[PDB]
Write a protein that binds this ligand. Structure first.
Ligand SMILES: NC(=O)c1ccc[n+]([C@@H]2O[C@H](COP(=O)([O-])OP(=O)(O)OC[C@H]3O[C@@H](n4cnc5c(N)ncnc54)[C@H](OP(=O)(O)O)[C@@H]3O)[C@@H](O)[C@H]2O)c1
Lengths: 262, 638, 82
């Protein structure tokens, strides 16, 4: 009923970076991608620009997976209740995301990570650091296939508590890379599908502005993982208490051919 | 070679017979000329069931109750998989019991059919081989007949039940009847006397009175001289309950088909309400049942299919989650459990805890038993019969075997050496063994830990509770081999040797000197006969269980430029075939390409989660060399 | 006099959740006597231990909270002494 968003997955569309996010081959819309759609919708209802609005999404339920299709157009309807903030990202007549989105003018962010300036992972040996090749080898082993657009964590500590998160002006990528810090904080072998984000605070006012046009080298924003409070904070974003459900890992290819060399 | 070995030498007789057929590959083995061929293994053989002394029930595909099979149990090693993390803190004293009957609850059906994931269960069960089954009735190590609740998998043939959860079967119940008592009555006492605080003469409303927990709740409530209101689906359930409990009159029964029980119960309690509500029904029946609560009434919600809002309430600590609390008390086995242990034991002595009516399903109808529980077409306990109770009352359990699918497991008290285990498949295979039982790893590399991915993985094994040791040495001389087994035997008996080491110099054969042709031949011809000489001597020979030597499909297909690697990979496979000739354990995976750790020779690289699925079959098999490769598509013509 | 500064937090922010969680070594607080509401009520149930009890005695309950009282979902403990 409210904003209808069209995602153009075409050859040169500006939102073609969204096909670089797959889980076991299938292309998927990021779980923290309907947060931006709800974020942009609420700002549109208020008449303000979405990057000047500080929102807070609470108890965001992910009911389905929005399967992207190359060279195709996906139309999703976002419906936000004026006063209470109840939002609904629904493709056709199927719900993909639900929750409550609330804007504010005060300080919503709990952690003070938005004030951190530099990267604490400076001067460390190469054997005490995780680089993007090593970070995304661990995700690939679990089925999360991220292309160059979604490879935002450029460096991290062995504990994955401290990280360097890339800021490229694309908010679906940035929110996903701040959820990758939570995923990087739960080592394992299974594939976990997010099902509930208890809180998601986005405050672009304390976030750096979009990089100049045509930028090739982007800045890295320090990120931190809080095990005590379970908050993945980087820049002006904060994801709290994300809950995931084990997903059966599907085979990209056909079954292997086993033989007895005799 | 037979008694008449061939004499292939220049102008010989056998050779000329071979220069006339002009066949590319001539192999004289087992007394006849032949060739090495890769014979396909049918997909049905991957799930072939073989006799196994210890087995346990799991699912081949999560969320499918028709995929339930019996797999090998890690209890053959004496211990149980999943001793990592929080399961390492509680050092509960456990008695090893031979399960004879296993009761099927609705907790297993909910997990088996995918209604709830394994992650909702207590965190101590995350790494367990299975999560199906809690109650059982079998025989402890002394031959006594015992029944009790244990952390899963109790749908197995052997269990390790904590001594604080084991009751003794009275000498009037068959083990069949004992299998029905423990969970149904332990839950009933928890809901009524531990969470509801039922007092004498209190009014209790019990949903689904025909369920095993419902039948137990009525029996516990009647012993407390309570006014019972129960919800019965049809008239058959009402008749069954009335016959089972003569104290129950028709006024004590309502219908689970409508919320018309609210007006009836409110009128029959004169507006006082019901002191305890054991709630299983959901939606408007949950709302109409809280509305019957008295001023001090307690609402015990034990239904499994909670709504999304209810789960968020559980997460936000708004409400307590009481539907996996008996499973959580079984992991801690503390003051709150020993209160339920004593309540049930007292009930057995006082006659309150009587066995329920049950239907016995064999071990091969496990799927049908689960379907019977799910449908809930008729009241009763579904009890899987694992063994046949002996006529005696204290007698050793005969040793028998059960048909079960393979499941590789590693002894946690033995040390496993991984030569080249500080790499891509070395470290991801090591993690697989850690989940399957290994807790003593000695990983060997030419340099040790040199990257932050290796240092983060090893710091993960150690946190899980694994005794890791990283040696920066190459096992290419007897001194190096001795050191790796001095460190292995210091950690524990050697129970596995793995050789994932690879060195590759790809080049054209005619642009390669000896120093460059013998490059890949160290990790494959020199570390395989220094690990095979050391595994053929005491004490390694008796303790060793696995001898895995990774190979490549270059020995079966060939490759361009890798003529030195092919020589090394083939001589490695010939050492492993010699091990089979001598009856020693040996496994030689011959992998094509691995993805996570593109199209080469028209073969797609496999995902690692699928390499470990076929690797598990590779280890639990009788052949030596197994070729695993994925085809882009079945070949057509030209 | 038995109260030291470590035993005190601020009612102006929900910064007491990290402090108390760290000071209890992740065990939580056994009893919560809650008067503050909103994000301070949520941050205080989140400090509850496994067996912890939450005694909410604030008077200015939200609309959803009152419906919970009406539906018997939660007990109303703010006029129980009366
Ligand atoms: N993953 C694949 O693409 C693939 C495909 C087909 C077959 N395979 C099979 O799997 C293995 C390769 O797996 P991978 O390369 O992904 O991981 P990996 O086997 O763990 O990597 C090879 C390791 O060998 C170690 N190494 C080499 N020479 C050694 C020596 N003399 N002593 C001790 N360690 C030594 C190296 O340790 P350092 O680096 O510290 O020196 C290196 O980490 C081979 O056995 C191969 O047949 C793999």
């Amino acid at each position: 009923s409210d904003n209808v968003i069209d995602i153009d997955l075409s050859e040169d569309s500006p939102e073609n970076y969204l096909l670089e996010h797959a889980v076991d081959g299938r292309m998927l819309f990021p779980a923290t991608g309907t947060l931006v759609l709800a974020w942009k919708t609420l700002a549109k209802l208020k008449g303000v620009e979405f990057e000047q609005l500080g929102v807070q999404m609470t108890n965001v339920q992910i009911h389905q997976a929005l399967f992207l299709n190359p060279g195709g157009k996906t139309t999703v309807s976002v419906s936000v209740m004026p006063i209470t903030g109840e939002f609904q990202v629904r493709d056709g007549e199927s719900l993909i995301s639900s929750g409550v989105i609330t804007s504010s003018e005060g300080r919503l962010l709990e952690t003070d990570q938005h004030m951190k300036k530099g990267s604490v992972l400076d001067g460390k040996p190469d054997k005490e650091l995780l680089f993007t090749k090593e970070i995304y080898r661990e995700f690939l082993l679990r089925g999360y296939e991220y292309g160059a657009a979604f490879q935002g964590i450029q460096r991290a500590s062995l504990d994955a508590t401290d990280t360097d998160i890339r800021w490229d002006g694309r908010w679906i990528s940035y929110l996903d890379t701040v959820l990758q810090m939570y995923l990087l904080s739960k080592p394992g072998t299974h594939q976990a599908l997010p099902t509930l984000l208890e809180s998601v605070t986005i405050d672009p006012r304390v976030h750096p502005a979009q990089p100049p046009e045509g930028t090739t080298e982007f800045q890295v924003l320090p990120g931190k993982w809080d095990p005590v409070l379970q908050i993945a904070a980087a820049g002006g974003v904060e994801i709290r208490s994300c809950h995931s459900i084990r997903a059966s890992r599907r085979l990209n290819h056909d079954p292997p051919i086993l033989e007895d060399f005799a | 070679a037979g008694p008449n070995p061939p004499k292939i030498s220049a102008d010989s007789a056998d050779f000329k017979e071979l220069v006339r057929k002009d066949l590319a590959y001539n192999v004289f083995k087992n007394g006849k000329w032949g060739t090495y061929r890769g014979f396909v293994i049918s997909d049905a053989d991957r799930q072939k069931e073989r006799p196994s002394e210890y087995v346990y029930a799991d699912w081949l595909s999560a969320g499918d109750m028709s995929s339930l099979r019996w797999f090998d149990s890690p209890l053959k090693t004496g211990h149980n998989n999943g001793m990592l993390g929080s399961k390492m803190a509680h050092k509960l004293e456990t008695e090893t019991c031979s399960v004879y009957y296993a009761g099927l609850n609705l907790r297993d059906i909910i997990l088996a059919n995918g209604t709830i994931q394994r992650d909702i269960l207590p965190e101590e069960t995350f790494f367990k081989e299975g999560v199906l089954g809690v109650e059982f009735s079998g025989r402890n190590s002394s031959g006594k007949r015992v029944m009790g609740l244990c952390p899963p998998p109790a749908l197995a043939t052997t269990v390790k039940c904590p001594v604080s959860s084991l009751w003794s079967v009275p000498d009037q119940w068959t083990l069949e009847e004992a299998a029905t008592v423990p969970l149904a009555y332990a839950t009933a006492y928890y809901c009524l006397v531990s969470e509801g605080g039922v007092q004498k003469g209190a009014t209790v409303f019990i949903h689904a009175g025909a369920s095993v927990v419902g039948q137990a709740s009525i029996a516990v409530a009647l012993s407390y001289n309570c006014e019972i209101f129960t919800l019965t689906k049809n008239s058959d359930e009402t008749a069954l309950l009335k016959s089972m409990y003569p104290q129950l009159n028709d006024r004590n029964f309502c219908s689970s088909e409508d919320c018309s029980f609210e007006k009836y119960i409110r009128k029959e309690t004169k507006g006082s309400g019901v002191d305890v509500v054991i709630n299983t029904l959901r939606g408007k029946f949950l709302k109409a049942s809280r509305r019957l609560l008295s001023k001090k009434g307690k609402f015990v919600d034990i239904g499994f299919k909670v709504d999304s809002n209810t789960q968020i309430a559980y997460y936000t600590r708004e409400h307590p989650d009481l539907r996996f609390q008996l499973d959580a008390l079984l992991e801690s086995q503390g003051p709150e459990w020993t209160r339920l242990f004593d309540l049930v034991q007292a009930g057995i002595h006082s006659g309150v805890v009587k066995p329920l009516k049950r239907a016995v399903y064999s071990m091969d109808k496990i799927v049908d038993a689960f379907k019977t529980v799910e449908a809930e077409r008729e009241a009763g306990k579904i009890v899987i019969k694992i063994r046949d109770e002996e006529r005696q009352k204290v007698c050793p359990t005969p040793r028998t075997s059960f048909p079960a699918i393979h499941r590789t497991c590693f002894h946690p008290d033995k040390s496993h050496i991984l030569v080249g285990g500080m790499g891509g498949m070395g470290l991801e295979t090591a993690h697989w063994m850690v989940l399957r039982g290994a807790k003593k790893l000695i990983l060997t590399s030419r340099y040790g830990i040199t990257t932050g991915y290796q240092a983060r993985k090893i710091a993960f094994f150690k946190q899980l509770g694994v005794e890791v040791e990283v040696l920066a040495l190459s096992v290419n001389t007897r001194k190096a081999a001795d050191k790796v087994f001095e460190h292995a035997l210091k950690m524990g008996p050697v129970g596995g040797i793995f050789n994932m080491a690879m060195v590759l110099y790809n080049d054209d054969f005619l642009k390669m000197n000896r120093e460059q042709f013998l490059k890949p031949l160290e990790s494959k011809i020199t570390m395989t006969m220094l690990l095979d000489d050391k595994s053929r001597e005491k004490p390694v020979r008796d303790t060793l269980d696995h001898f895995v030597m990774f190979s490549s499909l270059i020995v079966s297909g060939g490759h361009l430029g890798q003529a030195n690697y092919a020589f090394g990979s083939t001589v490695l496979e010939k050492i492993c075939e010699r091990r089979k000739r001598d009856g020693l354990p040996v496994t030689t995976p011959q992998w094509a390409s691995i993805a996570d750790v593109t199209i080469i020779c028209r073969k797609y690289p496999q995902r690692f989660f699928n390499v470990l699925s076929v690797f598990d079959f590779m280890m639990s098999s009788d052949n030596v060399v197994t070729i695993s490769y994925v085809l882009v598509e079945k070949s057509m013509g030209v």
